[PDB]
Amino acid sequence: AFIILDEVIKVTNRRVNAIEHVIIPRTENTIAYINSELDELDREEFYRLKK
Amino acid sequence: YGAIYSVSGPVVIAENMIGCAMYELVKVGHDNLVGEVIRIDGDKATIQVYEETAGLTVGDPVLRTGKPLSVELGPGLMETIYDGIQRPLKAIKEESQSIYIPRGIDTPALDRTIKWQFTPGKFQVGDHISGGDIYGSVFENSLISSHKILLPPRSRGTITWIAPAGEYTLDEKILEVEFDGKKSDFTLYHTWPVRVPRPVTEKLSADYPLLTGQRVLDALFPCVQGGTTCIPGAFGCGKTVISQSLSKYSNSDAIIYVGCGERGNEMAEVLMEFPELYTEMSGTKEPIMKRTTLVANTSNMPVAAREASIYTGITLAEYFRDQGKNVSMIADSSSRWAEALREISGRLGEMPADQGFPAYLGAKLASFYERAGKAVALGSPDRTGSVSIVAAVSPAGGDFSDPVTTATLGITQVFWGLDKKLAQRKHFPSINTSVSYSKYTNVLNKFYDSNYPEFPVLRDRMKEILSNAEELEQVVQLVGKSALSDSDKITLDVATLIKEDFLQQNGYSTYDAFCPIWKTFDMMRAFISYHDEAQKAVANGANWSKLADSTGDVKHAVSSSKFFEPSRGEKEVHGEFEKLLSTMQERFAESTD
Amino acid sequence: NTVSGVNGPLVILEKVKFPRYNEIVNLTLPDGTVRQGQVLEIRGDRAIVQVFEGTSGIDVKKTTVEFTGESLRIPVSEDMLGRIFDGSGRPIDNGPKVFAEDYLDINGSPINPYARIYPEEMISTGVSAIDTMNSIARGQKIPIFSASGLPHNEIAAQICRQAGLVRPTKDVHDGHEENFSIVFAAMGVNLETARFFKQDFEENGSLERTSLFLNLANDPTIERIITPRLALTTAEYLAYQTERHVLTILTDMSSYADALREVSAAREEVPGRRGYPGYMYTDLSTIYERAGRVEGRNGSITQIPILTMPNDDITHPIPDLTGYITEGQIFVDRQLHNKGIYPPINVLPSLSRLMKSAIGEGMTRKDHGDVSNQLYAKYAIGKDAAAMKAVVGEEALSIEDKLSLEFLEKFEKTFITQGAYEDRTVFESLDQAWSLLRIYPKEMLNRISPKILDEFY
Amino acid sequence: NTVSGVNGPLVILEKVKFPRYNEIVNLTLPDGTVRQGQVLEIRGDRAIVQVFEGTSGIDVKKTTVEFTGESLRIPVSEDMLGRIFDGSGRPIDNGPKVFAEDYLDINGSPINPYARIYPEEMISTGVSAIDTMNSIARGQKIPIFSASGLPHNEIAAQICRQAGLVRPTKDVHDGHEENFSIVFAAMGVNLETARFFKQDFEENGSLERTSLFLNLANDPTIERIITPRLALTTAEYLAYQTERHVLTILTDMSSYADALREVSAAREEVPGRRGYPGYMYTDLSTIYERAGRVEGRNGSITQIPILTMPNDDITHPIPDLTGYITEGQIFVDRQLHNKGIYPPINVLPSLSRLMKSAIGEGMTRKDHGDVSNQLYAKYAIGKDAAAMKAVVGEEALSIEDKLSLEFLEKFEKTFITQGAYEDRTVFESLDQAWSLLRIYPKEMLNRISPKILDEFY
Amino acid sequence: NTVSGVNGPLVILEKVKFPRYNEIVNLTLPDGTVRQGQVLEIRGDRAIVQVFEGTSGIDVKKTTVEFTGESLRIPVSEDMLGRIFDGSGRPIDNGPKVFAEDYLDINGSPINPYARIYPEEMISTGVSAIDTMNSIARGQKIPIFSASGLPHNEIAAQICRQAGLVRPTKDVHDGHEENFSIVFAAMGVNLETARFFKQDFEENGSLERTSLFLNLANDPTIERIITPRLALTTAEYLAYQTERHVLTILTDMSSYADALREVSAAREEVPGRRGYPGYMYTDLSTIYERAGRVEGRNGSITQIPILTMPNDDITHPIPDLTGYITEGQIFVDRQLHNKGIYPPINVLPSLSRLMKSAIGEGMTRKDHGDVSNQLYAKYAIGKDAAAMKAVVGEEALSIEDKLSLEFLEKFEKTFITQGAYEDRTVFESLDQAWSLLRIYPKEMLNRISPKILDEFY
């Protein structure tokens, strides 16, 4: 069992790093950048109607 | 009188108009087109013109009719397909050779040439009458007289003359009321303005259901008549199918089908389907179509008409509610109606503040919806009527957090979900438990307990299975599981069944979407029972693989029981399901030991 | 003179300067319909009126005007309690009106006397899950942040009805001796939803204790924004003059914010993010100025607004700004609703800003703070334990997780799950707390003083 | 009738009341050239015109105008076919006027009977991937959603090529018994690609059967929107008077949409959501108006529009508004393209709702809608099984997910991958689909009636 | 004439039509104080002015206007170093006066004579990361991209002070033969900043070396925009007339851009992407065009603008625009700063596309450019490996990856780590760089030409 545990721990240590370092900042950058562009289209329209 | 100052789109400006009301019907042009002065800024009137423009010139006379835009309510509304202000389509089809009314041509809302059979009421010479009272009837519909000839709301006086039975026309006089001298002559049809709601004596509690016939609808929360209901769509998730299927199962005495700004092939489809398709109880003669009044607008018609469509429909639903008939208002889709308000907002030259949709949108979406409900019929004779609005809603901002969807969820009480991704795998309606809620649940479930179903118990448990199953599924994806507790597998497994039997239904296979409310109770009963045995078996010891395999033969049968509908008797609780229950317990014993 | 024109619900009347700001004017149509309006703006040689009555069918040459000579004020009396009104204070109880003892300004109030002694004493609602975890003090602004996958309105009937019945249970603890009144405002309500609240208060014997204002989702926007303004004034008259605690329940804040978006572009001004006004705030603040303890220091206006987000959208201006003024919020879970736990509120993202100072004494315990800590931390570990269990199994689950697994189901089924007419003060909540906790050993309960614990485990 | 000003290509004319909506004017330039223009708006004591040939040479007092006196109408001939025509007509493209048999209004004012009559029998596009999954019926509008970074042009070309090759296969099927006509309206397309379209019609030997109207992206914006309107009017003539089945290809809807935005930057009308007109929907609907089944069942016009997604999202205005009108959609696939596949569409975002009821029998089976549904279900899972592999590994994968992975590949390179001169019968498509689908038991297949699945397994 | 009105930084004058564009006018306050402005817009019988100084206190008929009748030009002298000036065309510090021998316009073309021949002479900062990886030339434009957690002022000063000691070592080498001049302009920064800078220049050398323009944050936005223009006039004269190389340090460039943003908000001018003007491109350009070698070709203006990024994003409009225009990019990293590296310059995205113009070869090695490319390439691989070290561990990374992780660590801590006064010659840097390359084997250094690797190792 002991040899079997050693083989599994390595797959498991890899995953804990993988999520934090890659996934979480990829989600952050995508969401915020699209949020910012999306609000811009809406704001300029108001200014053009007003003008 | 007035003069056309400018023609800008389908929208017309006219100068020299004063002392006019803001819903006045106006005749624009030298062709005498229908139009409606929504607003006036000084002398200039903006008019929504409900016919095309391709040759309207300035300097042409504009004549006010001296009254609002109204609709005519009375005999011969059934079995006719109308546009959004009501013109009889059939008469046009032979005569003009057109379906979209061309300029130079106009016809009035009801027929003039058709005589009707008039039967006297309960009232006689000298009797006082007021709004929503029954002055007579005309025999229309398959199964009952549906047309009660009612005195229009807010009008009163004494009837000096009630005419005798015979056949009469609807431009012909048959009643006179005296109240301030002779009040007026009345005909069969009576007038009411569409932008103005009808009054009711009072609002009443919803407790009566409508049989939608849709197994997934009947299962997860109550089906309500008097209802307020939304179903999300997106155009390509089986939504049209479940609407026409819904029109056929509806068990209401009258159905008013409303095309907001639809496909146009579908406005053909519902027309062809109605006279040759049989209703659930089955009518006598032209089942669905006799019971149906149709307002049909395609996108291609004038946006002035598409704006009006929904109003015409609710005033018809409301008249019928006051007749003491139970009515289904089926509307598809409100977002197209909202898109129509938006088309007008840019053309008039308004200021939108809701992503290019008008600021006015929120007050109009709400005002319209509040007209549905169960209520006590307008008038003295006392009857009960209802209008249940089943409304489709859809994106329009492209988001799901766009104004259209924000306003609609707030005003509605019932939401049953639909997901596009699952719908593609073919399991529509593919209800999202999380977005779904019902307020009606408590009163409706109390009613159903009296009616015989033990429903409420199952309902919580149906929801409970689907909820835990959802959560478990993210945990299988996220960690990338190497094991599961033996109970959790059962939860997931029992949810899969729910998917097939309820959620997977096809509205053109009537073996695969039809169950009465009791049949629905029995099928769900079987599932909830399976979960109950299965949870106990693991507890007493037995492996999951043992549980699944030994249960085996009854597990196949329940899966495959979605291919049934009443056809073994006129009975709503079957031997089919009752036999399964005892066999299921027998199976449980095996699993356990 | 006559009406110059109409564009939207805006009516442009050609008049000199004769009405003062906010003066009601009566537009007299000759067709049996009299309509009232308020000048929204007065400008030179023109005034802009939005009509209370209708919105369309106005003449531009046959209308005549009369000046009422009275700017908008609310007739406030206290024989208003036990009566149903509409969005302009007219009765829908039917029968003769109640009239006034005062006409008080609705515009921001003509005297504004609100707190510079922070909230003390505890207010209970009648639900253990709200009281212990999210404690509310007299005049403290804690709203219920809700979503559209829940019936937000039901949960709202429940807090109103059960509130002020707690006050007699407190009279027995001898924490209260003063008469409690309740002010209810329903904004953008459906008929069916509206009747549901009236019938519920009627069962409890709370109807006599409350006044209800209904503005329906079919009545003008202007009428709808006025609806909370009238309600905040009634509560204030009772707090000030007669030294009463009044709890005002403002549902639905989204209806009110939406109404403001309709009047944003009605006006000649330019909105902010996502089309919602940048001066949305100014308006919201008007509600909030009336909120707090009145000078006299034994009367208050306590406020619970309900705000519904579309799908918990915090991209939307409305929860982000509203959340700043207020001191905490109560977050409701769809996940619990779906399981069939009702009420389905989750106490873990929920907050009460000042909680050791949002309670009183003699109607709370001092053990209140200690239990709020214990209850919270174990429910959170339990949420973790559910997810864990699924991966690891039960044949490899930790002994601490088992206690946390059980704790998760009992906290939900005892503290959160409770009946539609159950009532709770802090003592009752507190007894139920100790029975959940009893199962953990004393050495796992360490956020609690050894004193308290040896007495209540 | 002298010029007041010119702002943009839009021209402000002073003239006194006379012109009707969409009345043509002749612009007399001082260089001795007459150019045509349309009144977009007629007003009091001015009309505003936008000119179809350029904008050059507009002066104030050196220009004069004279009226055509006639609203815009198409000079229509049925000998128009076999020839290359243009919006205004040029002699250098060999077609300086149609030489009219009838003048019909382009707005279908004489008559326009459509959309109360239901779609008839199935028609072959020769592509298996469209025909099984989506039902293309005579007298239906089903659009092609296309995207950038992908030659959308190539897909339009494959449709043109395959049109007229299907029609003898149908004549035997009894899907056809009347003539076949292609009406090609090109607007805003690249010049190089326009020439590739012209060569495709000649090669097939289908030049005779088609009429071309070509509008460039250097030809003015009002002119650009009117060209598809001309071509649909021509389709109505053939379909109704001489009972032709018309397939009209209208490319590229993106160029139409753009035109809408640029105009109305100088009218009273003022664009909607993101600078795209709120009345963009009205424009669209005028194109969809002259499409559908025809009364009395003399012929049909069937329409296949080509839309290019410019941002590569369908949440953008051009796909979004158009999609609500349309009866389903067929959306392309970016990923297949990169691989090298042609035609590179995918089936997961592609759905036709009216599929079961529309179709005929005797060259499209009863099992057609059944099998589509099954093919999508296995594909949804296959796509997801790829995604779980990326993140975690073979950790959440299993025997079921592993099958699905195999399925996604075999389907992509066998069903979707075909030739561009391959004519595929609806009978062929179904035969191939079943062969592929053998990968799971009969008991795993329950998205199909157990009756049907035994016959055809 | 007299002030009509005032709306923000815009002033409405009711005047007469004789004024020309950017003609100075002086506003006489009732205090008898005169403040200067220039007409931004002129119309018939009226003007809009933007006043440099102030923006409030401006009256009506108690105030008066007086015309100067000279459009703004800056009084430029060559005796400007050592002399204290204020950013307003004169010292308001009471520093030594400006004098004039020419008055030169700031419009962006006075007599402007620039590069028909690109930079070829190397100018060093004494800092390896700057010089080796990107290089600096006698016309080079390099943006310092800085942050709100980096100290922007310390790096700004660092680059300038160390480039003054190196630059005479380069004069002796015959890289130069002409003077060095510094023009330092601070615009609208804090007092704390301003003081700091002056202190830094004194320590290293003197303040005789540099000329100072000081502008205070309390002074308007309109002042801030003129502040760099004043710097440009100073530098162009020195290069043109007296064949001096001029080095301009322009802090803060972001300060200037926000100012532009304010005169479109309180103007009716509609802004572009992210609320930053549409004509933002032109405003920025004006600074950057007036760079390169100056006629005679011994004079020059070389630019180092200093940008502080507020969000620290590379999607913000200011860093993006600047980058396309400028001949290089120098990115300074918060993470290096934290770790203890000074200067803490990250070269991962530092790039020059005009890399050839930037390097030298007649007073620097020819090998300089060849080594730099290899270094950058090997640094980048070393970063790809760093992310992979966190994920995968050392449990699968390759023999080649291990060399690249070592290189990365040795590279930060030796090359980029330099004393506060320690200056490195460009030749010595090569030797350091060769130490960094030396650990990799001859098969890993395969991309480089064989000739160079066998020669120098």
Query: Is A45 within 8 Å of D393 when comparing Cβ atoms?
Result: no
Contacts of B435 in chain C (CB under 8 A): 148-149, 311, 334
Query: Is A35 within 8 Å of C315 when comparing Cβ atoms?
Result: yes
B350: closest CA of chain A, how far (Å):
9
Consult the annotation and say whether B234 binds a ligand: yes
Q: Distances in Å between the alpha carbon of B141 and those of B249, B293, C160, E1?
A: 17, 11, 48, 85
Q: Distances in Å between the alpha carbon of B201 and those of B133, B377, C33, C93, D111?
A: 11, 6, 21, 15, 47
Alpha carbons C319 and C313: distance in angstroms, whole number = 8
Query: Is B352 within 8 Å of A42 when comparing Cβ atoms?
Result: no
Of D41, D281, D380, the CB nearest to B8: D41
CA dihedral B447, B449, B453, B458 (to 10 degrees): 100
Query: Is D112 within 8 Å of B100 when comparing Cβ atoms?
Result: yes
DSSP string, D377-424: HHHHHHHHHHHHHHHT-SSS--HHHHHHHHHHHHHHHHTS---SS---
D330: closest CA of chain B, how far (Å):
10
Query: Is D275 within 8 Å of A11 when comparing Cβ atoms?
Result: no
Task: Tally Cβ neighbours within 10 Å of residue C444.
Answer: 13
Of B18, B407, B434, the CB nearest to C61: B18
Of C60, C192, C310, the CB nearest to B20: C60
Alpha carbons D1 and D8: distance in angstroms, whole number = 19
Query: Is D118 within 8 Å of B268 when comparing Cβ atoms?
Result: yes
Long-range contacts of B536-544 (CB under 8 A, 24+ apart): B536/B588, B536/B592, B537/B588, B537/B591, B537/B592, B538/B486, B538/B487, B538/B490, B540/B592, B541/B592, B542/B591, B542/B592, B542/B593, B543/B486, B544/B486, B544/B489, B544/B490
Of D270, D274, D391, the CB nearest to A49: D270
Alpha carbon B458 to chain centroid distance?
Answer: 28
Strands D64-71, D23-28: parallel, antiparallel or unpaired by DSSP?
antiparallel
Query: Is C275 within 8 Å of A50 when comparing Cβ atoms?
Result: no
Contacts of D273 in chain A (CB under 8 A): 45
Q: SS3 for D263? A: coil
B2 and D CB contact within 8 Å = no
Contacts of A46 in chain E (CB under 8 A): none
* Of B224, B221, B210, the residue nearest B459 (C-alpha): B221
Residue D272 near residue B352 (C-beta atoms within 8 A): yes
Does B contact A via 3+ CB–CB distances below 8 Å?
yes
Element of type H or E holding D40: strand D34-43
B201 and C CB contact within 8 Å = no
Alpha carbons D61 and B324: distance in angstroms, whole number = 72
Q: In what order do the strands lie in the sheet with E64-71?
A: E2-7, E10-14, E46-51, E34-43, E23-28, E64-71
- Mutation test of the interface with chain C: which of A5, A11, A33, A42, choosing the one with the most C Cβ atoms within 10 A? A42
Helix D253-262 crosses helix D317-325 at what angle (to 10 degrees)? Answer: 110
A4: closest CA of chain E, how far (Å):
17
A6: closest CA of chain D, how far (Å):
17
Q: Distances in Å between the alpha carbon of B466 and those of B427, B473, B562, B584?
A: 15, 11, 19, 22
Q: Distances in Å between the alpha carbon of E107 and those of C443, E71, E238, E264, E303?
A: 78, 11, 18, 19, 18
Q: Residue E324 has which token pair?
A: 């396309």
Alpha carbons B561 and B577: distance in angstroms, whole number = 9
Q: Distances in Å between the alpha carbon of D175 and those of C35, D119, D178, D426?
A: 65, 13, 9, 11
Backbone angles phi and psi of C379, in degrees to 5: -60, -35
Of B58, B425, B479, the CB nearest to D42: B58
* CA dihedral sign of residues D70, D72, D78, D80: positive
Which chains contact D through at least 3 pairs of Cβ atoms less than 8 Å apart? A, B
Detail the residues of C annotated as belonging to a binding site for ATP: 353
DSSP string, D151-193: -HHHHHHHHHHHTTTHHHHHHHHTS--S-EEEEEEEES--HHH
Residue C8 near residue C266 (C-beta atoms within 8 A): yes
Q: Distances in Å between the alpha carbon of D98 and those of D73, D194, D249?
A: 12, 21, 20
Residue B510 contacts by C-beta under 8 Å, 6 or more apart in sequence? B565
Alpha carbons C322 and B144: distance in angstroms, whole number = 56
Instruction: Tell me the Ramachandran region of residue B461: left when phi exceeds 0, alpha when psi lies from -120 to 50, beta otherwise.
Output: alpha
Residue B274 contacts by C-beta under 8 Å, 6 or more apart in sequence? B286, B288, B289, B292, B294
Interface of B with D in 407-466 (CB under 8 A): 421, 424-426
Alpha carbons D438 and C381: distance in angstroms, whole number = 48
Query: Is D320 within 8 Å of B398 when comparing Cβ atoms?
Result: yes
- Mutation test of the interface with chain B: which of D112, D120, D267, D318, choosing the one with the most B Cβ atoms within 10 A? D112
Size of interface B-C (CB pairs under 8 A): 177
Residue B561 near residue B501 (C-beta atoms within 8 A): yes
- Mutation test of the interface with chain B: which of C3, C50, C60, C196, choosing the one with the most B Cβ atoms within 10 A? C60
* CA dihedral sign of residues E121, E123, E128, E130: negative
Exposed / middle / buried, residue D195 (Cβ in 10 Å: 0-12, 13-18, 19+): exposed
Alpha carbons D394 and D410: distance in angstroms, whole number = 21
Q: Residue D390 has which token pair?
A: 């990326």
Alpha carbons B161 and B401: distance in angstroms, whole number = 59
Of B9, B99, B272, the CB nearest to D118: B272
Query: Is B355 within 8 Å of A42 when comparing Cβ atoms?
Result: yes
Residue D382 near residue D408 (C-beta atoms within 8 A): yes
Instruction: Tell me the Ramachandran region of residue B233: left when phi exceeds 0, alpha when psi lies from -120 to 50, beta otherwise.
Output: beta
Alpha carbons C429 and C437: distance in angstroms, whole number = 13
Alpha carbons E433 and D5: distance in angstroms, whole number = 69
Resolution as reported, in Å = 7.6
Q: Residue B145 has which token pair?
A: 């007289």
Alpha carbons E135 and E365: distance in angstroms, whole number = 12
| Technique used to solve these coordinates | cryo-EM
Nearest CA in chain B to C270: B353
Nearest CA in chain A to C267: A50
